[PDB]
PDB file of all heavy atoms in Angstrom:
ATOM      1  N   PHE A   9      86.641  37.723  47.166  1.00 44.15           N
ATOM      2  CA  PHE A   9      87.918  37.294  47.741  1.00 44.15           C
ATOM      3  C   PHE A   9      89.035  37.383  46.703  1.00 44.15           C
ATOM      4  O   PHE A   9      90.037  38.066  46.919  1.00 44.15           O
ATOM      5  CB  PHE A   9      87.830  35.864  48.299  1.00 44.15           C
ATOM      6  CG  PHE A   9      87.050  35.755  49.588  1.00 44.15           C
ATOM      7  CD1 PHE A   9      85.788  35.178  49.614  1.00 44.15           C
ATOM      8  CD2 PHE A   9      87.586  36.235  50.775  1.00 44.15           C
ATOM      9  CE1 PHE A   9      85.078  35.084  50.796  1.00 44.15           C
ATOM     10  CE2 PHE A   9      86.880  36.142  51.959  1.00 44.15           C
ATOM     11  CZ  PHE A   9      85.626  35.567  51.970  1.00 44.15           C
ATOM     12  N   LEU A  10      88.831  36.740  45.557  1.00 41.97           N
ATOM     13  CA  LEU A  10      89.838  36.724  44.495  1.00 41.97           C
ATOM     14  C   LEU A  10      90.134  38.138  43.995  1.00 41.97           C
ATOM     15  O   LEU A  10      91.283  38.486  43.735  1.00 41.97           O
ATOM     16  CB  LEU A  10      89.385  35.827  43.327  1.00 41.97           C
ATOM     17  CG  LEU A  10      89.686  34.324  43.480  1.00 41.97           C
ATOM     18  CD1 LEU A  10      91.191  34.065  43.428  1.00 41.97           C
ATOM     19  CD2 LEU A  10      89.089  33.772  44.773  1.00 41.97           C
ATOM     20  N   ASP A  11      89.091  38.953  43.870  1.00 40.52           N
ATOM     21  CA  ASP A  11      89.242  40.320  43.373  1.00 40.52           C
ATOM     22  C   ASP A  11      89.964  41.188  44.397  1.00 40.52           C
ATOM     23  O   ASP A  11      90.905  41.904  44.063  1.00 40.52           O
ATOM     24  CB  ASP A  11      87.875  40.933  43.035  1.00 40.52           C
ATOM     25  CG  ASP A  11      87.975  42.374  42.548  1.00 40.52           C
ATOM     26  OD1 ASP A  11      88.546  42.601  41.463  1.00 40.52           O
ATOM     27  OD2 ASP A  11      87.476  43.286  43.243  1.00 40.52           O
ATOM     28  N   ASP A  12      89.536  41.090  45.650  1.00 41.99           N
ATOM     29  CA  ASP A  12      90.081  41.914  46.727  1.00 41.99           C
ATOM     30  C   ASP A  12      91.552  41.587  46.967  1.00 41.99           C
ATOM     31  O   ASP A  12      92.386  42.487  47.098  1.00 41.99           O
ATOM     32  CB  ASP A  12      89.274  41.710  48.020  1.00 41.99           C
ATOM     33  CG  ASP A  12      89.741  42.619  49.154  1.00 41.99           C
ATOM     34  OD1 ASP A  12      89.217  43.750  49.276  1.00 41.99           O
ATOM     35  OD2 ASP A  12      90.624  42.209  49.936  1.00 41.99           O
ATOM     36  N   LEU A  13      91.870  40.295  46.999  1.00 43.86           N
ATOM     37  CA  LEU A  13      93.233  39.843  47.277  1.00 43.86           C
ATOM     38  C   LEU A  13      94.127  40.015  46.050  1.00 43.86           C
ATOM     39  O   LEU A  13      95.351  39.941  46.153  1.00 43.86           O
ATOM     40  CB  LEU A  13      93.235  38.380  47.744  1.00 43.86           C
ATOM     41  CG  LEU A  13      92.369  38.084  48.984  1.00 43.86           C
ATOM     42  CD1 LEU A  13      92.543  36.637  49.434  1.00 43.86           C
ATOM     43  CD2 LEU A  13      92.696  39.047  50.122  1.00 43.86           C
ATOM     44  N   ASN A  14      93.509  40.230  44.891  1.00 42.65           N
ATOM     45  CA  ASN A  14      94.246  40.500  43.657  1.00 42.65           C
ATOM     46  C   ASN A  14      94.573  41.992  43.555  1.00 42.65           C
ATOM     47  O   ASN A  14      95.718  42.375  43.310  1.00 42.65           O
ATOM     48  CB  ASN A  14      93.429  40.046  42.436  1.00 42.65           C
ATOM     49  CG  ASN A  14      94.223  40.048  41.136  1.00 42.65           C
ATOM     50  OD1 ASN A  14      95.150  40.834  40.950  1.00 42.65           O
ATOM     51  ND2 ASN A  14      93.866  39.153  40.226  1.00 42.65           N
ATOM     52  N   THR A  15      93.556  42.832  43.759  1.00 41.75           N
ATOM     53  CA  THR A  15      93.713  44.281  43.644  1.00 41.75           C
ATOM     54  C   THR A  15      94.526  44.839  44.805  1.00 41.75           C
ATOM     55  O   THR A  15      95.092  45.934  44.723  1.00 41.75           O
ATOM     56  CB  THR A  15      92.338  45.000  43.554  1.00 41.75           C
ATOM     57  OG1 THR A  15      92.519  46.402  43.310  1.00 41.75           O
ATOM     58  CG2 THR A  15      91.520  44.817  44.825  1.00 41.75           C
ATOM     59  N   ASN A  16      94.594  44.072  45.879  1.00 44.76           N
ATOM     60  CA  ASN A  16      95.393  44.423  47.038  1.00 44.76           C
ATOM     61  C   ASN A  16      96.494  43.381  47.218  1.00 44.76           C
ATOM     62  O   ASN A  16      96.224  42.188  47.138  1.00 44.76           O
ATOM     63  CB  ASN A  16      94.510  44.481  48.289  1.00 44.76           C
ATOM     64  CG  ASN A  16      93.475  45.598  48.245  1.00 44.76           C
ATOM     65  OD1 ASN A  16      93.750  46.737  48.627  1.00 44.76           O
ATOM     66  ND2 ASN A  16      92.269  45.276  47.806  1.00 44.76           N
ATOM     67  N   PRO A  17      97.742  43.806  47.499  1.00 44.12           N
ATOM     68  CA  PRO A  17      98.898  42.889  47.608  1.00 44.12           C
ATOM     69  C   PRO A  17      98.820  41.942  48.814  1.00 44.12           C
ATOM     70  O   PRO A  17      99.819  41.333  49.204  1.00 44.12           O
ATOM     71  CB  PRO A  17     100.091  43.836  47.755  1.00 44.12           C
ATOM     72  CG  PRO A  17      99.521  45.105  48.293  1.00 44.12           C
ATOM     73  CD  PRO A  17      98.131  45.212  47.728  1.00 44.12           C
ATOM     74  N   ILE A  18      97.637  41.838  49.397  1.00 44.73           N
ATOM     75  CA  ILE A  18      97.378  40.929  50.512  1.00 44.73           C
ATOM     76  C   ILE A  18      97.844  39.516  50.188  1.00 44.73           C
ATOM     77  O   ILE A  18      98.702  38.956  50.870  1.00 44.73           O
ATOM     78  CB  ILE A  18      95.869  40.902  50.870  1.00 44.73           C
ATOM     79  CG1 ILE A  18      95.363  42.318  51.193  1.00 44.73           C
ATOM     80  CG2 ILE A  18      95.606  39.958  52.042  1.00 44.73           C
ATOM     81  CD1 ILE A  18      96.026  42.943  52.401  1.00 44.73           C
ATOM     82  N   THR A  19      97.268  38.966  49.131  1.00 44.06           N
ATOM     83  CA  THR A  19      97.593  37.618  48.644  1.00 44.06           C
ATOM     84  C   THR A  19      97.706  36.601  49.791  1.00 44.06           C
ATOM     85  O   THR A  19      98.558  35.711  49.771  1.00 44.06           O
ATOM     86  CB  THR A  19      98.903  37.630  47.806  1.00 44.06           C
ATOM     87  OG1 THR A  19      99.972  38.240  48.549  1.00 44.06           O
ATOM     88  CG2 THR A  19      98.706  38.381  46.491  1.00 44.06           C
ATOM     89  N   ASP A  20      96.841  36.741  50.797  1.00 47.06           N
ATOM     90  CA  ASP A  20      96.827  35.820  51.935  1.00 47.06           C
ATOM     91  C   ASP A  20      95.640  34.870  51.827  1.00 47.06           C
ATOM     92  O   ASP A  20      94.510  35.213  52.182  1.00 47.06           O
ATOM     93  CB  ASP A  20      96.783  36.575  53.271  1.00 47.06           C
ATOM     94  CG  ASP A  20      98.077  37.314  53.580  1.00 47.06           C
ATOM     95  OD1 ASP A  20      99.141  36.660  53.646  1.00 47.06           O
ATOM     96  OD2 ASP A  20      98.034  38.543  53.783  1.00 47.06           O
ATOM     97  N   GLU A  21      95.925  33.673  51.339  1.00 47.41           N
ATOM     98  CA  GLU A  21      94.912  32.655  51.064  1.00 47.41           C
ATOM     99  C   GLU A  21      94.203  32.200  52.343  1.00 47.41           C
ATOM    100  O   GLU A  21      93.118  31.616  52.298  1.00 47.41           O
ATOM    101  CB  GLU A  21      95.603  31.459  50.399  1.00 47.41           C
ATOM    102  CG  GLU A  21      96.491  31.849  49.219  1.00 47.41           C
ATOM    103  CD  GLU A  21      97.551  30.804  48.891  1.00 47.41           C
ATOM    104  OE1 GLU A  21      98.588  30.767  49.596  1.00 47.41           O
ATOM    105  OE2 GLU A  21      97.358  30.016  47.940  1.00 47.41           O
ATOM    106  N   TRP A  22      94.822  32.487  53.479  1.00 48.58           N
ATOM    107  CA  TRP A  22      94.351  32.008  54.776  1.00 48.58           C
ATOM    108  C   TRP A  22      92.934  32.504  55.081  1.00 48.58           C
ATOM    109  O   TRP A  22      92.158  31.818  55.753  1.00 48.58           O
ATOM    110  CB  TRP A  22      95.335  32.445  55.869  1.00 48.58           C
ATOM    111  CG  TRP A  22      96.769  32.226  55.471  1.00 48.58           C
ATOM    112  CD1 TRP A  22      97.747  33.175  55.365  1.00 48.58           C
ATOM    113  CD2 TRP A  22      97.375  30.982  55.091  1.00 48.58           C
ATOM    114  NE1 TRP A  22      98.921  32.597  54.950  1.00 48.58           N
ATOM    115  CE2 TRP A  22      98.719  31.252  54.780  1.00 48.58           C
ATOM    116  CE3 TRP A  22      96.914  29.664  54.992  1.00 48.58           C
ATOM    117  CZ2 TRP A  22      99.605  30.260  54.371  1.00 48.58           C
ATOM    118  CZ3 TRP A  22      97.796  28.679  54.586  1.00 48.58           C
ATOM    119  CH2 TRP A  22      99.128  28.982  54.283  1.00 48.58           C
ATOM    120  N   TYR A  23      92.594  33.688  54.566  1.00 47.02           N
ATOM    121  CA  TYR A  23      91.262  34.261  54.773  1.00 47.02           C
ATOM    122  C   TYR A  23      90.195  33.376  54.141  1.00 47.02           C
ATOM    123  O   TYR A  23      89.090  33.234  54.671  1.00 47.02           O
ATOM    124  CB  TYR A  23      91.177  35.679  54.194  1.00 47.02           C
ATOM    125  CG  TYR A  23      92.134  36.654  54.848  1.00 47.02           C
ATOM    126  CD1 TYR A  23      93.208  37.195  54.150  1.00 47.02           C
ATOM    127  CD2 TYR A  23      91.965  37.021  56.176  1.00 47.02           C
ATOM    128  CE1 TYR A  23      94.084  38.072  54.759  1.00 47.02           C
ATOM    129  CE2 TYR A  23      92.835  37.902  56.790  1.00 47.02           C
ATOM    130  CZ  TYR A  23      93.893  38.423  56.077  1.00 47.02           C
ATOM    131  OH  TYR A  23      94.772  39.291  56.689  1.00 47.02           O
ATOM    132  N   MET A  24      90.540  32.773  53.008  1.00 46.09           N
ATOM    133  CA  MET A  24      89.628  31.879  52.304  1.00 46.09           C
ATOM    134  C   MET A  24      89.290  30.670  53.171  1.00 46.09           C
ATOM    135  O   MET A  24      88.130  30.270  53.270  1.00 46.09           O
ATOM    136  CB  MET A  24      90.235  31.416  50.974  1.00 46.09           C
ATOM    137  CG  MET A  24      89.411  30.346  50.275  1.00 46.09           C
ATOM    138  SD  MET A  24      87.716  30.866  49.966  1.00 46.09           S
ATOM    139  CE  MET A  24      87.995  32.204  48.812  1.00 46.09           C
ATOM    140  N   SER A  25      90.308  30.105  53.809  1.00 42.32           N
ATOM    141  CA  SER A  25      90.120  28.956  54.685  1.00 42.32           C
ATOM    142  C   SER A  25      89.221  29.337  55.860  1.00 42.32           C
ATOM    143  O   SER A  25      88.397  28.542  56.319  1.00 42.32           O
ATOM    144  CB  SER A  25      91.475  28.445  55.188  1.00 42.32           C
ATOM    145  OG  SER A  25      91.331  27.245  55.928  1.00 42.32           O
ATOM    146  N   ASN A  26      89.385  30.569  56.337  1.00 38.91           N
ATOM    147  CA  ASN A  26      88.550  31.111  57.409  1.00 38.91           C
ATOM    148  C   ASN A  26      87.080  31.149  56.984  1.00 38.91           C
ATOM    149  O   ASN A  26      86.179  30.908  57.791  1.00 38.91           O
ATOM    150  CB  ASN A  26      89.046  32.518  57.791  1.00 38.91           C
ATOM    151  CG  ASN A  26      88.078  33.274  58.688  1.00 38.91           C
ATOM    152  OD1 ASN A  26      88.094  33.119  59.910  1.00 38.91           O
ATOM    153  ND2 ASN A  26      87.251  34.120  58.086  1.00 38.91           N
ATOM    154  N   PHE A  27      86.853  31.448  55.708  1.00 41.40           N
ATOM    155  CA  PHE A  27      85.507  31.481  55.142  1.00 41.40           C
ATOM    156  C   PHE A  27      84.955  30.063  54.962  1.00 41.40           C
ATOM    157  O   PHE A  27      83.842  29.761  55.390  1.00 41.40           O
ATOM    158  CB  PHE A  27      85.520  32.229  53.799  1.00 41.40           C
ATOM    159  CG  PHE A  27      84.196  32.207  53.072  1.00 41.40           C
ATOM    160  CD1 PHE A  27      83.076  32.825  53.614  1.00 41.40           C
ATOM    161  CD2 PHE A  27      84.074  31.566  51.846  1.00 41.40           C
ATOM    162  CE1 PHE A  27      81.864  32.802  52.948  1.00 41.40           C
ATOM    163  CE2 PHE A  27      82.865  31.542  51.179  1.00 41.40           C
ATOM    164  CZ  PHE A  27      81.759  32.159  51.731  1.00 41.40           C
ATOM    165  N   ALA A  28      85.760  29.198  54.347  1.00 42.21           N
ATOM    166  CA  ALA A  28      85.351  27.824  54.043  1.00 42.21           C
ATOM    167  C   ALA A  28      85.132  27.007  55.316  1.00 42.21           C
ATOM    168  O   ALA A  28      84.506  25.948  55.287  1.00 42.21           O
ATOM    169  CB  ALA A  28      86.394  27.155  53.151  1.00 42.21           C
ATOM    170  N   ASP A  29      85.676  27.499  56.424  1.00 44.48           N
ATOM    171  CA  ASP A  29      85.501  26.868  57.732  1.00 44.48           C
ATOM    172  C   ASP A  29      84.041  26.921  58.177  1.00 44.48           C
ATOM    173  O   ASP A  29      83.552  26.012  58.855  1.00 44.48           O
ATOM    174  CB  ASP A  29      86.394  27.562  58.771  1.00 44.48           C
ATOM    175  CG  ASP A  29      86.055  27.173  60.204  1.00 44.48           C
ATOM    176  OD1 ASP A  29      86.575  26.146  60.693  1.00 44.48           O
ATOM    177  OD2 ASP A  29      85.268  27.902  60.850  1.00 44.48           O
ATOM    178  N   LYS A  30      83.348  27.984  57.784  1.00 44.97           N
ATOM    179  CA  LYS A  30      81.970  28.205  58.205  1.00 44.97           C
ATOM    180  C   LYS A  30      81.055  27.122  57.623  1.00 44.97           C
ATOM    181  O   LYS A  30      80.780  27.105  56.423  1.00 44.97           O
ATOM    182  CB  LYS A  30      81.499  29.605  57.777  1.00 44.97           C
ATOM    183  CG  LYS A  30      80.126  29.990  58.324  1.00 44.97           C
ATOM    184  CD  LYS A  30      80.097  29.959  59.853  1.00 44.97           C
ATOM    185  CE  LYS A  30      78.728  30.344  60.404  1.00 44.97           C
ATOM    186  NZ  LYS A  30      78.369  31.750  60.082  1.00 44.97           N
ATOM    187  N   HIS A  31      80.592  26.217  58.485  1.00 46.93           N
ATOM    188  CA  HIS A  31      79.778  25.082  58.048  1.00 46.93           C
ATOM    189  C   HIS A  31      78.371  25.539  57.666  1.00 46.93           C
ATOM    190  O   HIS A  31      77.457  25.544  58.495  1.00 46.93           O
ATOM    191  CB  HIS A  31      79.704  24.004  59.140  1.00 46.93           C
ATOM    192  CG  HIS A  31      81.045  23.507  59.599  1.00 46.93           C
ATOM    193  ND1 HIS A  31      81.597  22.312  59.182  1.00 46.93           N
ATOM    194  CD2 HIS A  31      81.940  24.049  60.456  1.00 46.93           C
ATOM    195  CE1 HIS A  31      82.771  22.146  59.767  1.00 46.93           C
ATOM    196  NE2 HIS A  31      83.002  23.186  60.543  1.00 46.93           N
ATOM    197  N   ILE A  32      78.216  25.956  56.417  1.00 47.42           N
ATOM    198  CA  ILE A  32      76.924  26.375  55.883  1.00 47.42           C
ATOM    199  C   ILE A  32      76.712  25.770  54.497  1.00 47.42           C
ATOM    200  O   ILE A  32      77.663  25.616  53.729  1.00 47.42           O
ATOM    201  CB  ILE A  32      76.807  27.923  55.794  1.00 47.42           C
ATOM    202  CG1 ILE A  32      77.966  28.508  54.963  1.00 47.42           C
ATOM    203  CG2 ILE A  32      76.771  28.547  57.189  1.00 47.42           C
ATOM    204  CD1 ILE A  32      77.898  30.012  54.774  1.00 47.42           C
ATOM    205  N   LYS A  33      75.468  25.414  54.184  1.00 47.13           N
ATOM    206  CA  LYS A  33      75.143  24.859  52.875  1.00 47.13           C
ATOM    207  C   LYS A  33      74.989  25.988  51.857  1.00 47.13           C
ATOM    208  O   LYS A  33      73.955  26.654  51.784  1.00 47.13           O
ATOM    209  CB  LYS A  33      73.888  23.969  52.940  1.00 47.13           C
ATOM    210  CG  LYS A  33      72.665  24.618  53.585  1.00 47.13           C
ATOM    211  CD  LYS A  33      71.494  23.638  53.671  1.00 47.13           C
ATOM    212  CE  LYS A  33      71.837  22.417  54.522  1.00 47.13           C
ATOM    213  NZ  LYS A  33      70.743  21.410  54.527  1.00 47.13           N
ATOM    214  N   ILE A  34      76.054  26.212  51.102  1.00 44.61           N
ATOM    215  CA  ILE A  34      76.131  27.324  50.161  1.00 44.61           C
ATOM    216  C   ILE A  34      75.332  27.060  48.882  1.00 44.61           C
ATOM    217  O   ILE A  34      74.667  27.959  48.360  1.00 44.61           O
ATOM    218  CB  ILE A  34      77.608  27.635  49.798  1.00 44.61           C
ATOM    219  CG1 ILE A  34      78.324  26.372  49.275  1.00 44.61           C
ATOM    220  CG2 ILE A  34      78.344  28.211  51.011  1.00 44.61           C
ATOM    221  CD1 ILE A  34      79.786  26.590  48.942  1.00 44.61           C
ATOM    222  N   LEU A  35      75.387  25.824  48.390  1.00 45.11           N
ATOM    223  CA  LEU A  35      74.786  25.470  47.102  1.00 45.11           C
ATOM    224  C   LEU A  35      74.170  24.074  47.148  1.00 45.11           C
ATOM    225  O   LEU A  35      74.241  23.386  48.165  1.00 45.11           O
ATOM    226  CB  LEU A  35      75.849  25.526  45.996  1.00 45.11           C
ATOM    227  CG  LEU A  35      76.413  26.922  45.697  1.00 45.11           C
ATOM    228  CD1 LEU A  35      77.632  26.818  44.797  1.00 45.11           C
ATOM    229  CD2 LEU A  35      75.345  27.809  45.057  1.00 45.11           C
ATOM    230  N   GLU A  36      73.554  23.676  46.041  1.00 44.14           N
ATOM    231  CA  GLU A  36      73.038  22.320  45.878  1.00 44.14           C
ATOM    232  C   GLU A  36      74.066  21.468  45.141  1.00 44.14           C
ATOM    233  O   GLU A  36      75.077  21.989  44.663  1.00 44.14           O
ATOM    234  CB  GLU A  36      71.720  22.353  45.101  1.00 44.14           C
ATOM    235  CG  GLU A  36      70.657  23.201  45.782  1.00 44.14           C
ATOM    236  CD  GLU A  36      69.437  23.439  44.911  1.00 44.14           C
ATOM    237  OE1 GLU A  36      68.557  22.556  44.852  1.00 44.14           O
ATOM    238  OE2 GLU A  36      69.358  24.510  44.272  1.00 44.14           O
ATOM    239  N   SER A  37      73.793  20.176  45.029  1.00 44.64           N
ATOM    240  CA  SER A  37      74.735  19.237  44.419  1.00 44.64           C
ATOM    241  C   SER A  37      75.090  19.639  42.985  1.00 44.64           C
ATOM    242  O   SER A  37      76.261  19.851  42.662  1.00 44.64           O
ATOM    243  CB  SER A  37      74.127  17.831  44.435  1.00 44.64           C
ATOM    244  OG  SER A  37      72.828  17.838  43.856  1.00 44.64           O
ATOM    245  N   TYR A  38      74.071  19.800  42.148  1.00 44.32           N
ATOM    246  CA  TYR A  38      74.276  20.125  40.739  1.00 44.32           C
ATOM    247  C   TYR A  38      74.777  21.561  40.577  1.00 44.32           C
ATOM    248  O   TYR A  38      75.572  21.857  39.679  1.00 44.32           O
ATOM    249  CB  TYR A  38      72.978  19.898  39.945  1.00 44.32           C
ATOM    250  CG  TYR A  38      71.773  20.673  40.457  1.00 44.32           C
ATOM    251  CD1 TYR A  38      71.360  21.850  39.840  1.00 44.32           C
ATOM    252  CD2 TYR A  38      71.048  20.225  41.558  1.00 44.32           C
ATOM    253  CE1 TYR A  38      70.264  22.552  40.303  1.00 44.32           C
ATOM    254  CE2 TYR A  38      69.952  20.925  42.024  1.00 44.32           C
ATOM    255  CZ  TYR A  38      69.564  22.088  41.394  1.00 44.32           C
ATOM    256  OH  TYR A  38      68.472  22.788  41.856  1.00 44.32           O
TER     257      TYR A  38
END
């Protein structure tokens, strides 16, 4: 995300929120 939106003048943070919306357990606590 950071690389794609950096290398491309997209700079639309909204896509990130679209991703973070997906209720999935990505990692553990630590």
Side-chain angles (χ1 to χ4, degrees):
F9 287 108
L10 276 292
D11 178 66
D12 184 90
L13 303 185
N14 191 330
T15 186
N16 294 273
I18 303 297
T19 53
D20 291 302
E21 310 159 281
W22 315 120
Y23 298 113
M24 173 57 65
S25 186
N26 168 85
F27 175 64
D29 167 86
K30 187 59 180 296
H31 304 259
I32 56 178
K33 52 183 61 184
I34 55 182
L35 294 169
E36 301 170 82
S37 53
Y38 57 100

